[PDB]
Design a protein around this motif. Structure first.
Motif, PDB file in Angstrom:
ATOM      1  N   UNK B 143       2.487   2.155   4.030  1.00 21.78           N
ATOM      2  CA  UNK B 143       1.195   2.462   4.358  1.00 21.78           C
ATOM      3  C   UNK B 143       0.212   2.404   3.209  1.00 21.78           C
ATOM      4  N   UNK B 144       0.489   1.614   2.309  1.00 22.10           N
ATOM      5  CA  UNK B 144      -0.772   1.444   1.179  1.00 22.10           C
ATOM      6  C   UNK B 144      -1.203  -0.259   1.016  1.00 22.10           C
ATOM      7  N   UNK B 145      -2.418  -0.478   1.158  1.00 23.99           N
ATOM      8  CA  UNK B 145      -2.829  -1.729   1.041  1.00 23.99           C
ATOM      9  C   UNK B 145      -4.061  -1.899   0.062  1.00 23.99           C
ATOM     10  N   UNK B 164      -8.885   4.024   5.171  1.00 22.89           N
ATOM     11  CA  UNK B 164      -7.356   4.261   4.691  1.00 22.89           C
ATOM     12  C   UNK B 164      -6.637   4.265   5.804  1.00 22.89           C
ATOM     13  N   UNK B 165      -5.398   4.040   5.685  1.00 20.51           N
ATOM     14  CA  UNK B 165      -4.592   3.266   6.820  1.00 20.51           C
ATOM     15  C   UNK B 165      -4.131   4.737   7.752  1.00 20.51           C
ATOM     16  N   UNK B 173      -5.477  -0.537   8.875  1.00 17.40           N
ATOM     17  CA  UNK B 173      -6.719  -0.447   8.107  1.00 17.40           C
ATOM     18  C   UNK B 173      -7.749  -1.518   8.413  1.00 17.40           C
ATOM     19  N   UNK B 174      -8.933  -1.129   7.802  1.00 22.16           N
ATOM     20  CA  UNK B 174      -9.980  -2.197   8.204  1.00 22.16           C
ATOM     21  C   UNK B 174     -10.925  -2.220   6.750  1.00 22.16           C
ATOM     22  N   UNK B 175     -11.665  -3.341   6.623  1.00 21.46           N
ATOM     23  CA  UNK B 175     -12.472  -3.614   5.463  1.00 21.46           C
ATOM     24  C   UNK B 175     -13.884  -4.275   6.030  1.00 21.46           C
ATOM     25  N   UNK B 194      -6.033  -9.780   1.114  1.00 19.84           N
ATOM     26  CA  UNK B 194      -5.383  -8.295   1.350  1.00 19.84           C
ATOM     27  C   UNK B 194      -4.049  -8.531   0.472  1.00 19.84           C
ATOM     28  N   UNK B 195      -3.652  -7.577  -0.188  1.00 20.33           N
ATOM     29  CA  UNK B 195      -2.513  -7.688  -1.022  1.00 20.33           C
ATOM     30  C   UNK B 195      -1.609  -6.094  -0.680  1.00 20.33           C
ATOM     31  N   UNK B 196      -0.348  -6.415  -0.081  1.00 18.66           N
ATOM     32  CA  UNK B 196       0.439  -5.334   0.573  1.00 18.66           C
ATOM     33  C   UNK B 196       1.673  -5.532  -0.368  1.00 18.66           C
TER      34      UNK B 196
END
Ligand SMILES: [F-]
Ligand code: NA
Ligand code: NA
Ligand code: NA
Ligand code: NA
Ligand code: NA
Ligand code: NA
Lengths: 29, 208, 228
Positions: B143-145, B164-165, B173-175, B194-196
């Motif tokens: 749960x971190x992106x 934040x997720x 989450x959203x941007x 997006x980097x996960x």
């Protein structure tokens, strides 16, 4: 009885708890 | 109770103990409450170790010296939440306090990669002299992106806002990128990157 | 059905006063104490104090003296919280709960617990006035589709304060709905988006409508989202 009577008693008992513990700690120490 | 560890981590199926420490706990029992994001608190344990009828047997309460503890036996994903202790404080007159709370992280859940969806500005918003690109990120287990925006082949950080997720049992989450209409038609494309974990994903929209 | 029902969200200016209500149902109001709990943004639960529902006597927690007043209207099984001379830092969710007490094993001691909770009342204190949202469609397209399913949504833009609630088809559509947390823009206004994943084959036959409620500005917007 009404349960909230316990909270009213709590106020009185808590003051004497503080009195009793401090006088006790003074006697045994 | 007074003090409580800010964060704690667990593994699915293992046991964890959340502990509160405070002088008043030498004389008074604690009650324990669970709060999931956006939800109202729920009573888990009262009088040190009594369990309300709705609460699963996984949750247990104990106490020792100036400390009180909540333990979870069969840790599951639904137990990832904030946990608060409550009891009397140190005042001579009756007064009560919550512990600071403990965020519980249950590790080892099925790992999933993020799904990214990017929406261009709607014609209606453009007609209102505004332009907003929406980047939505969903269905990740870690749960971190991290998010990064790009205008044409060049990056852009002016106008970005990100959330934040939160859980849907996967996270999301959203941007957002705020722009004006002439810009929208003045750049050939915009991209949300997006980097996960180690993987990165990129989506692009264009005024066509 | 034992429950506590709290009043709706509110916006106030610094220096004003607010009164929040908490109505009990399913049990005899004056048989149990009531307490109040504050939760500020990003922070933990805070004990505010309790009120004797049999006598009306309030007992304020440390740090909640002066501007906070607990009262009751037993004829309608309702407890009230009044905050005067409001400050920006009073912005928080306020909970009422039933405050239970029982004798402990040790004489002169008790244990306590909050068994029923209200859903909370959001109180925002700000010098800015309320602003209703503008709602724009996030139309489905090939770039919002995967396999047989498409994503469609609503952009709820530039509102203040929190919160807004979003439903789909008047609450009819719940599976496949996710409403994201709001984002705070440099202008001090909030925005959020809600999405629903549906069968791509339905986009030509079924109607999809966003219902957006913003109580602080007394605004409700319904937006039909269609392709193109
Ligand atoms: F006591
Ligand atoms: Na402590
Ligand atoms: Na978000
Ligand atoms: Na331009
Ligand atoms: Na209210
Ligand atoms: Na208001
Ligand atoms: Na009282």
């Amino acid at each position: 009885k009404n349960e909230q009577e316990l909270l009213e008693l709590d106020k009185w008992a808590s003051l004497w708890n503080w009195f009793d513990i401090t006088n006790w700690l003074w006697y045994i120490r | 109770e007074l003090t409580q560890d800010p964060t704690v981590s667990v593994a699915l199926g293992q046991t964890v103990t959340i502990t509160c420490q405070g002088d008043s706990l030498r004389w008074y029992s604690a009650s324990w409450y669970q709060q999931k994001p956006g939800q109202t608190p729920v009573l888990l344990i009262y009088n040190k170790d009594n369990r309300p009828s709705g609460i699963p047997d996984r949750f247990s309460g104990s106490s020792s010296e100036n400390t009180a503890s909540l333990t979870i036996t069969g840790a599951q994903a639904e137990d990832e939440a904030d946990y608060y202790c409550h009891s009397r404080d140190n005042n001579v007159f009756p007064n009560w306090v919550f512990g600071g709370g403990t965020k519980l992280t249950v590790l080892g859940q099925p790992k999933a990669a993020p799904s990214v969806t990017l929406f261009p500005p709607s014609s209606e918003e453009l007609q209102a002299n505004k332009a907003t690109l929406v980047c939505l990120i969903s269905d990740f287990y870690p749960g971190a992106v991290t998010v990064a925006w790009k205008a044409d082949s060049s990056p852009v950080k002016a106008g970005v806002e990100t959330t934040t997720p939160s859980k849907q049992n996967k996270y999301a989450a959203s941007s957002y990128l705020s722009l004006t209409p002439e810009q929208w038609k003045s750049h050939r494309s915009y991209s949300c990157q997006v980097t996960h974990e180690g993987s990165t994903v990129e989506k692009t929209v264009a005024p066509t | 059905q034992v429950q506590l029902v709290q009043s709706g969200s509110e916006l106030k200016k610094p220096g004003a006063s607010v009164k929040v209500s908490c109505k009990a149902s399913g049990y005899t109001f004056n048989n149990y104490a009531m307490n109040w709990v504050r939760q500020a943004p990003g922070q933990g639960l805070e004990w505010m104090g309790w009120i004797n529902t049999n006598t009306g006597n309030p007992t304020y927690g440390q740090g909640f003296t002066g501007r906070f007043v607990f009262s009751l209207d037993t004829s309608v099984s309702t407890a009230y919280l009044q905050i005067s001379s409001l400050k920006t830092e009073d912005t928080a969710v306020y909970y009422c709960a039933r405050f239970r007490v029982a004798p402990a094993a040790q004489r002169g001691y008790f244990y306590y617990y909050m068994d029923v909770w209200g859903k909370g009342t959001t109180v925002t204190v700000s010098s800015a006035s309320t602003k209703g949202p503008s709602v724009f469609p996030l139309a489905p397209s090939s770039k919002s589709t995967s396999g047989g399913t498409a994503a469609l949504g609503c952009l709820v833009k530039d509102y203040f304060p929190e919160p807004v609630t979003v439903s789909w088809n008047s609450g009819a559509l719940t599976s496949g709905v996710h409403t994201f947390p709001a984002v705070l823009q440099s202008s001090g206004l909030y925005s959020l988006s809600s999405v629903v994943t549906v069968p791509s084959s339905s986009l030509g036959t079924q109607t999809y409508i966003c219902n957006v409620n913003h109580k602080p500005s007394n605004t409700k917007v319904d937006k039909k989202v269609e392709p193109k």
